[PDB]
């Protein structure tokens, strides 16, 4: 019951290079890393995770962020994976799966991938399952 005052601007605005959407900060990193190594990068900077896409509007924001970067990349990592290889999907942040956006023929049963990327052919709006050892660029999400 000491400092009962209003939030400073650092808790309402996101830092240079990152963009705000509904109380979180987001950024696209063009470094090509495995899914696990990408999630670790996100954890190391302001205690985030690979992005979790929980609504259609959040998916539209993330797609716009990637397009605005000017990247020529085909695949971008998001935080969804199948850890027990039994087609039960989880977000690395622990959030519930409240939204899905699978592309045509996904998730595959005939040549299954266990990690998920956004595809450039769909304007970064639809998802594909791919091997977790692939090296792709990625989007991080962190609270602030
Ligand atoms: C809210 O502000 C607390 C500091 O407040 C003054 C101060 O005494 O320094 C209150 C003054 O009215 C104000 N003066 C003017 C003219 O605005 C100043 C200035 O706003 C400030 O100097 C910037 O120039 O602030 C701030 O430190 C407090 O923080 C927290 O304090 C708690 C401790 O009791 C606990 O440590 C919190 O975890 C910590 O964030 C600020 N509150 C929040 C939620 O950020």
Curated annotation (Swiss-Prot):
Q: Which domain of life is it from?
A: Eukaryota
GO biological process terms, alphabetically, are: antimicrobial humoral immune response mediated by antimicrobial peptide; positive regulation of cell population proliferation; response to peptide hormone
Q: Which Pfam families match?
A: Lectin_C
Return the PANTHER family for the record.
MANNOSE, PHOSPHOLIPASE, LECTIN RECEPTOR RELATED
Molecular functions (GO terms): growth factor activity; molecular function inhibitor activity; oligosaccharide binding; peptidoglycan binding; signaling receptor activity
Question: According to its record, what are the GO cellular component terms?
Answer: extracellular exosome; extracellular space
Q: Which residues carry this modification: Pyrrolidone carboxylic acid?
A: 1
Q: Which pairs are disulfide-linked?
A: 14-25, 42-140, 115-132
Question: Which cell locations does it reside in?
Answer: Secreted
Query: What region holds the C-type lectin domain?
Result: 12-142
What is the protein's known function?
Answer: Might act as an inhibitor of spontaneous calcium carbonate precipitation. May be associated with neuronal sprouting in brain, and with brain and pancreas regeneration.
In its record, the post-translational modification comment is: The composition of the O-linked carbohydrate on Thr-5 is complex and varied. In the crystallographic structure, the attached sugar appears to be N-acetylglucosamine, typical of an intracellular protein, rather than N-acetylgalactosamine.
Chain positions carrying an annotated carbohydrate: 5
This protein is called what? Answer: Lithostathine-1-alpha
List the Gene3D superfamilies.
Mannose-Binding Protein A, subunit A
Q: Which UniProt keywords apply?
A: Disulfide bond, Glycoprotein, Lectin, Pyrrolidone carboxylic acid, Secreted, Signal
- Tissue specificity: In pancreatic acinar cells and, in lower levels, in brain. Enhanced expression of PSP-related transcripts and intraneuronal accumulation of PSP-like proteins is found in brain from Alzheimer disease and Down syndrome patients.
Q: Which InterPro entries match?
A: C-type_lectin-like, C-type_lectin-like/link_sf, C-type_lectin/snaclec_domain, C-type_lectin_CS, CTDL_fold
PROSITE patterns per UniProt: C_TYPE_LECTIN_1, C_TYPE_LECTIN_2
